[PDB]
RNA sequence: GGAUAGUGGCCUACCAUGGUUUCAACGGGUAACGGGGAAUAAGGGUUCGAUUCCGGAGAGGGAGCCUGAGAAACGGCUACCACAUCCAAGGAAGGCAGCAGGCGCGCAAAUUACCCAAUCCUAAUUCAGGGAGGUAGUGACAAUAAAUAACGAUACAGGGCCCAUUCGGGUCUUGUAAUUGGAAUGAGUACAAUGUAAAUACCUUAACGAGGAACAACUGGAGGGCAAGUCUGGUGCCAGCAGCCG
RNA sequence: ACCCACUCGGCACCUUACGAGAAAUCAAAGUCUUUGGGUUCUGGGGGGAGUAUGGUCGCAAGGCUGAAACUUAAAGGAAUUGACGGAAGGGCACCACCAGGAGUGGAGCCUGCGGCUUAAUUUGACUCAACACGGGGAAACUCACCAGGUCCAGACACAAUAAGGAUUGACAGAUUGAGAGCUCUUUCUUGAUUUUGUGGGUGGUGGUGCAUGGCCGUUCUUAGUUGGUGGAGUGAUUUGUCUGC
RNA sequence: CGGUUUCAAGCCGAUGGAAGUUUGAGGCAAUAACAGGUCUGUGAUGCCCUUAGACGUUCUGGGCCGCACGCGCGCUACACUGACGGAGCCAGCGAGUACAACCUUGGCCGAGAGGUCUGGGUAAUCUUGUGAAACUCCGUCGUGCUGGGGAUAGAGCAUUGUAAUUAUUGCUCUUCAACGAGGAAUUCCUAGUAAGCGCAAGUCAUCAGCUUGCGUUGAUUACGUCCCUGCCCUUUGUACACACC
RNA sequence: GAAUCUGGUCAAACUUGGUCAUUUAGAGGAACUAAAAGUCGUAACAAGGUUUCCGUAGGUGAACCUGCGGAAGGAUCAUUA
């Protein structure tokens, strides 16, 4: 088995052995670098409310805030569903943030 | 078999071997 | 087949003279993937049972002995033979009166110290000159004790090294 | 048998009374001529021990 | 100082505490005698050197010594061990790792032959002796040189072709036939004389000595590696071959 | 605090590689058969084995140090194409599914195949792609199965009788399922066709479809397949054969 | 022609047009294969079998169809969209004998089946408009294992064949069983199709629940999607390459 | 000028121990390797059906498992504000 990647675990370069983060789903300790650190900026209320809440509510405009779950995923855990998405050898060089 | 265990296997085999040769001083 | 014929069950020894069958023999065949191994000693466990179930009374030497005896002496040769399961075949009267021979079947099982028994009897007279001739059958059952062949068998297997039978 | 069965089981063919192949130089004189001088027939490539033309 | 031929911790007395060492002291191993050399063979090397020369050791071990210029000799002696001989039992004689021979060991290695004529050596010495040394025998250790037919003719085929109305003479040259024929040859023997210490053998020959039956080439191999059988009979996963592949 | 240009120090990418590299790749893993800047260390097929031993160190666990005998033809590495994946995207198809229909499975009956049974219940085919198939809806035939009998359809070759017959036929009833001369009872036919042996064949719904041919079926009627240049690679290969629609 | 789509490839809707689903359906159908099936289509066949007590052939009787019981195609029904009577009454594919015995109208006999005379036909000519069925009309019974449903049975009357019991089939009357729409499952299907209905040749002397064709009646529901199933690529991984057995 | 003989000295060898090296019987144990091929599972390889690994503790019937830490030779060179 040669290198799949040049980076591998990524942030760790010029940096002995950093601390780790328990994943979300599996609770699988993974370094905070190998971690797949997605950001889940979700609304406090789901879209298919929202009217209903604002109808029954006091005040106008409202807080209507957004919870800020900075997730993590143990790569495996991530692949099983999440942003990972197994790319082609040539495509694996791309660091560009997807979509957008 | 898995090499770490093949290591662990021969660790016990030594620790049995140590009791055997110690039984004759 | 070559063993059990070389190395039989009862004695721990060879020989003779064994038909032996064969009928039918169900294979499948195959490819196989069969003996030399499976058939290489299937026959052995067979031919042992074919040996065993029949009888085998078991055979023995026997060395022809032909002794250059004098006439005035050497009755004692006859007593030496009568002892040993011996059968005199002939008593050839030579032209010279002081010479004789006694062509005789003698088992080699029983001819140990043969000359020693001959010498004392004849008084150092008559000169053994024996030779091998032909196999002679016995009457003893092997598995059953108190028999000439069976006692020889039990002794022979003890010399080899068991199991009994 | 299970000990030199084949050696016995073959029909022994007898050494035929065929003439002396010559020794020393005259042997070379054959091989020189049976390659260089005579020149054997070739359809495509050269061949030093032929076959009777069949499968 | 003692000793020694003599230098010296070579030995002795008294004194000092040195001496060597990771630039491998010390220790162990060596199926190690050293060197010359040997094989291999671009260059660099590796491995070997018991062995024809030069050193060194040893004469069963380990000691001790006589004589002698030179010996810690062993084809001198004394002893002890180890091994063994000869006996009339009181006692004697020994030492092939000189040569030959034998055992033993082992995969493994020669004849108890003839000679001082050479080579040299020794002495009281031109004159004697010398298993030092030479001479053969045995000798597939190595190495060197090379016979295992050659020239014909006739008889049947390949190649040049004067010309290719179809041939064919075959005028010219090559290969095949138990044809056949003339011409040599040492493999051998053997008067001789060589050779030689005497012989052998070599070189030389008086005299004989070739006709396929003789005066005879084996070894290995014949799928690949790697040169070369899809021939004829067997064999039939066996028996076997096969460095490897198989 | 930026912008922009350049600079010493740090941590990493892109493209071509003309340089390296077995390649993956690497601006070092370059400046190496055009072989030499300096230095330390480690490795010499795989295993056996980080074992045995001996040190040495440790409270111990264990470490450091470190064997061979024996064993074996490969162990690897990298990549190529396949095949496969309880990997992820993108397709297709009523042999997939929806929205429906007709159903079948239940019922009885046919008719396949199991299973049992039998003297035989002959066999082939067992996911799609065996199972109303063998064109197989068998009363005998078909027929391969079983119980019974008949016949030579025993080519040719060589020999023993070679007419004092080589051998063929044969009504009658017992025989025999039986106007089978199947034969034993018979004593008339038949003329070298044969019969007795030994080579040798011929036939065989025998055997093996894992020895084969042809045909078929099936992958799949799915959309796949290939080469010629040209490029990329030492190379197996690949690109062409593709982001989309 | 119209939108719709980088105003491409094409798709979607109207108009006309017999036909606007590749116009409908098949026929052939690549590379590579599979140890698929066939040695029981084969004088297609290698080699093991055998080769006269033949595993050859041939006769004669059986047997493949036997039944506690498993699945698999099928048929008939569980009726009132019916059943039973009459009446009306319209197809297409076909197929068919002279050296045999085929299709067989028309006339008489017979409740039938089926006989018989006679024809026509080697066939767009005769069978044959194959006036097939389901259908359409007027009546009987009305939702009761009832006239639904015909199985099992008994007896006879026919027909094929040399031979019909282990009913060959048909017809006659009688028997009236199970089954009031079928669980888990799962098959087939997108138009003159499905479903119904019958015909037809194939095999066949005789047998149709079978089959390849045919025409009649003729919907429901999509006209999509990858949820399942399968397959296909593509990227990815792979100690696999006899390739997930 | 002999035997004989008093000290020395060199020191064989023996005696009876002690000690290194090389050999070599050794009951037993505990291995490791070849294998015809058998049981028991099926660990790893596919995310190999709990991702593999390593170090290191504990446990087991065997592969193995489970902590902790680590590594991807990972099933990810990727989430922007
Ligand atoms: Mg790998
Ligand atoms: Mg990997
Ligand atoms: Mg740093
Ligand atoms: Mg670190
Ligand atoms: Mg001095
Ligand atoms: Mg030495
Ligand atoms: Mg040396
Ligand atoms: Mg030397
Ligand atoms: Mg030596
Ligand atoms: Mg010397
Ligand atoms: Mg000696
Ligand atoms: Mg000495
Ligand atoms: Mg000397
Ligand atoms: Mg000497
Ligand atoms: Mg000697
Ligand atoms: Mg020699
Ligand atoms: Mg000499
Ligand atoms: Mg000689
Ligand atoms: Mg000569
Ligand atoms: Mg040869
Ligand atoms: Mg050969
Ligand atoms: Mg070759
Ligand atoms: Mg050979
Ligand atoms: Mg090694
Ligand atoms: Mg049918
Ligand atoms: Mg029938
Ligand atoms: Mg036939
Ligand atoms: Mg190209
Ligand atoms: Mg391609
Ligand atoms: Mg079409
Ligand atoms: Mg096949
Ligand atoms: Mg056949
Ligand atoms: Mg049947
Ligand atoms: Mg069907
Ligand atoms: Mg008509
Ligand atoms: Mg009723
Ligand atoms: Mg399919
Ligand atoms: Mg003294
Ligand atoms: Mg998982
Ligand atoms: Mg597993
Ligand atoms: Mg796993
Ligand atoms: Mg590795
Ligand atoms: Zn997780």
Swiss-Prot record, chain B:
GO annotation terms (biological process): cytoplasmic translation
Sorted UniProt keywords: Cytoplasm, Ribonucleoprotein, Ribosomal protein
Listed GO MF terms: structural constituent of ribosome
Region (Disordered) residue spans: 1-25
Cellular component aspect of the GO annotation: cytosol; cytosolic large ribosomal subunit
Location in the cell: Cytoplasm
Homology family: Belongs to the eukaryotic ribosomal protein eS32 family.
Subunit note: Component of the small ribosomal subunit (SSU). Mature yeast ribosomes consist of a small (40S) and a large (60S) subunit. The 40S small subunit contains 1 molecule of ribosomal RNA (18S rRNA) and 33 different proteins (encoded by 57 genes). The large 60S subunit contains 3 rRNA molecules (25S, 5.8S and 5S rRNA) and 46 different proteins (encoded by 81 genes).
Main function: Component of the ribosome, a large ribonucleoprotein complex responsible for the synthesis of proteins in the cell. The small ribosomal subunit (SSU) binds messenger RNAs (mRNAs) and translates the encoded message by selecting cognate aminoacyl-transfer RNA (tRNA) molecules. The large subunit (LSU) contains the ribosomal catalytic site termed the peptidyl transferase center (PTC), which catalyzes the formation of peptide bonds, thereby polymerizing the amino acids delivered by tRNAs into a polypeptide chain.
Miscellaneous section: Present with 11900 molecules/cell in log phase SD medium.
Name of the protein this chain belongs to: Small ribosomal subunit protein eS32A
Lineage, uppermost ranks: Eukaryota, Fungi, Dikarya, Ascomycota, Saccharomycotina
């Amino acid at each position: 088995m040669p290198k799949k990647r040049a980076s591998n675990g990524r942030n760790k370069k010029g940096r002995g052995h950093v601390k780790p983060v328990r994943c979300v789903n599996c609770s699988r300790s993974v370094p905070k670098d190998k971690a797949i650190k997605r950001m889940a900026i979700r609304n406090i209320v789901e879209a298919a409310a929202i009217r209903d809440l604002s109808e029954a509510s006091v005040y106008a405009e409202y807080a209507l805030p957004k919870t800020y779950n900075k997730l993590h995923y143990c790569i495996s855990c991530a692949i099983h569903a999440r942003i990972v998405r197994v790319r082609s050898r040539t495509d694996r060089r791309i660091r560009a943030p997807p979509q957008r | 078999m898995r090499a770490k265990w093949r290591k662990k296997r021969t660790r016990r085999l030594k620790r049995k071997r140590r009791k055997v040769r110690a039984r004759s001083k | 087949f070559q063993w059990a014929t070389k190395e039989g069950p009862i004695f721990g020894e060879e020989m003779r003279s064994v038909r032996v069958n064969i009928l039918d023999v169900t294979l499948h065949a195959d490819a196989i993937h069969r003996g030399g191994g499976q058939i290489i000693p299937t026959m052995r466990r067979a031919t042992y049972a074919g040996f065993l179930l029949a009888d085998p009374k078991i055979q023995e030497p026997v060395f022809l002995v032909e002794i250059q005896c004098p006439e005035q002496a050497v009755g004692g040769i006859y007593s030496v033979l009568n002892k040993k399961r011996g059968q005199v075949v002939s008593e050839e009267q030579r032209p010279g009166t002081p010479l004789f021979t006694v062509k005789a079947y003698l088992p080699v099982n029983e001819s140990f110290g043969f000359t020693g028994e001959l010498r004392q009897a004849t008084g150092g007279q008559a000169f053994p000159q024996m030779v091998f001739d032909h196999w002679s059958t016995l009457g003893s059952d092997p598995l059953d004790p108190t028999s000439k062949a069976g006692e020889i068998v039990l002794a022979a297997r003890k010399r080899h090294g068991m199991k009994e039978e | 048998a299970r000990a030199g069965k084949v050696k016995s089981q073959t029909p022994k063919v007898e050494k035929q009374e065929k003439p002396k192949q010559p020794k020393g130089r005259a042997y070379k004189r054959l091989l020189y001529t049976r390659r260089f001088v005579n020149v054997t027939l070739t359809n495509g490539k050269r061949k030093m021990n032929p076959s009777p033309s069949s499968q």
